[PDB]
């Protein structure tokens, strides 16, 4: 019983990959421009100097 009480939450925070979920949320937002950045082969603008 003590092992279950101290192991359910242990396996919960132990089996967690929320970083990929955050990346997936950002993908849901603008994936066609962020993940699929295959439109231009090189940029064309100025820099800072």
């Amino acid at each position: 019983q003590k092992l279950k009480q101290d192991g359910d939450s242990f396996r919960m925070k132990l089996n967690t990959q929320e970083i990929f979920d955050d990346w997936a949320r950002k993908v849901q937002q603008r994936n066609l421009g962020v993940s699929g950045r295959i439109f231009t082969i090189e940029s064309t603008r100025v820099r800072g100097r």
Binding site: S43, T44, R45, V46, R47
Partner: peptide, 13 residues
């Protein structure tokens, strides 16, 4: 440099 940026972003504003 500046000339390269102008030759590249001329059509890309």
């Amino acid at each position: 440099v500046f000339l390269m940026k102008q030759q590249s972003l001329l059509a890309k504003q």
